[PDB]
């Protein structure tokens, strides 16, 4: 049953949301989206605008729905507006004020221990979300298939491997990684890119996380591995402290190595 109706309309287009901001172009970002910072507008918060074209549009779309879901549970940027056209995605979010964990670690070297404890506690909060809440699958089976396609499509950044794999052909990382399998299933809600760049401190407090496009159910080491790796630029004591504060007695080196190798593909 269908009735014939009149012509309705929408109330908000992207143009009005952008009035009176200064524009800046930041670096690429997780999956290569163009990133704009919107600032310098009186009585209006700093915003971020992400624009993905083609394949990258899917990544931006993926980030949009995860922002939408996860913000019910954790402090995340707020979606102001999102647009999807056939070859394009635009995602406008409110900025989380402050500096990245990386920035604060460099500016307050003596605060490393407090920074790691905060990071560990925040990660525990994230991991405590019961998986029954989460509609996203990011498990190793799913990620391995993503990794395979990126390799096969010629997309892996072989110049950006960790030092222990510096100069390895992508195919060698792929083969060697498969020797660490299988290992015991573990499932928690994960961030997916839990680096020092993606946690935001303001006035000495960890107040939020960003770049949530890889969020979903996966092994907790997906997040522990990536952060552990980042802390490796700073000190082995901070690396160790992460696991200690988190509450793990004997870091599973197999799972650790696997998730570090897996992230080489992304
Ligand atoms: N390609 C896009 C991705 O590029 C980076 O990810 C890469 C890491 O940076 C690499 O590691 C290097 O940088 C770390 C700090 O990030 C250092 O601790 C480490 N010792 C360094 O070797 C790691 N080998 C691969 C991983 N794909 C971004 O983080 C990620 O968001 C983005 O999507
Ligand atoms: C990339 C994106 C849009 C997720 N992004 N990036 C940043 C960011 C903040 C500080 C620095 Cl120094 C660099 C980036 C950021 C933010 N604060 N709030 C929300 N999204 C942010
Ligand atoms: Cl793009
Ligand atoms: Na929230």
The finding on whether 213 has its CB within 6 A of some atom of ligand 2 is no
Structure determined by: X-ray
β-pairing verdict for 88-94 and 47-53: antiparallel
Cα angle for residues 159, 261, 74 (degrees, 5° grid): 105
- Nearest Cα neighbor of 93 from 123, 112, 71, 72 is 71
User: What is the stated resolution of the deposited model, in angstroms?
Assistant: 2.0
User: Domains of the chain, with CATH numbers?
Assistant: 1-94 (3.30.200.20), 95-266 (3.90.1200.10)
The finding on whether 35 has its CB within 6 A of some atom of ligand 2 is yes
The finding on whether 29 has its CB within 6 A of some atom of ligand 2 is yes
Q: What separation in angstroms does the CA of 159 have from each of 4, 9, 83, 167?
A: 60, 50, 34, 7
CA of 27 to the centre of ligand 1 (A): 14
Distance of CA 148 to the CA centre of its chain: 20
- Any idea which residue has 């080196």 for tokens? 253
User: Would you name the residues annotated as active-site residues?
Assistant: 193
Residue among 63, 150, 256, 263 to mutate when testing ligand 1 (max atoms within 8 A of CB):
263
- Report d(CA 264, CA 207) in Å as an integer: 28
**Six token digits for residue 114:** 């407090």
């Amino acid at each position: 049953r269908e009735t014939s109706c009149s012509r309705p309309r929408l109330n908000s287009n992207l143009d009005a949301d952008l009035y009176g901001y200064r524009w800046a172009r930041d670096n690429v970002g997780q999956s290569g989206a163009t990133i704009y910072r919107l600032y310098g507008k009186p009585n209006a918060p700093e915003l971020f605008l992400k624009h993905g074209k083609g394949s990258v549009a899917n990544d931006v779309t993926d980030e949009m729905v995860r922002l939408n879901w996860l913000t019910a549970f954790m402090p995340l940027p707020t979606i102001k507006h999102f647009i999807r056209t056939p070859d394009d995605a635009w995602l406008l979010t409110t900025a989380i004020p402050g500096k990245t964990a990386f920035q604060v670690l460099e500016e307050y070297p003596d605060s490393g221990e407090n920074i790691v404890d905060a990071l560990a506690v925040f990660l525990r909060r994230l991991h405590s979300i019961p998986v029954c809440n989460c509609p996203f699958n990011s498990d190793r089976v799913f990620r391995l298939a993503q990794a395979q396609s990126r390799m096969n499509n010629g997309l892996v950044d072989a110049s950006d491997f960790d030092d222990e794999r510096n100069g390895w052909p992508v195919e060698q990382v792929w083969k060697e990684m498969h020797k660490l399998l299988p290992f015991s299933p573990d499932s928690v809600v994960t961030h997916g890119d839990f680096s020092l760049d993606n946690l935001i401190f303001d006035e000495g407090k960890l107040i939020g996380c960003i770049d949530v496009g890889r969020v979903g159910i996966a092994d907790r080491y997906q997040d522990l591995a990536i952060l552990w790796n980042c802390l490796g630029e700073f000190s082995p004591s901070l690396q160790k402290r992460l696991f200690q504060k988190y509450g793990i007695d004997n870091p599973d080196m197999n799972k650790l190595q696997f998730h570090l190798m897996l992230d080489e593909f992304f």
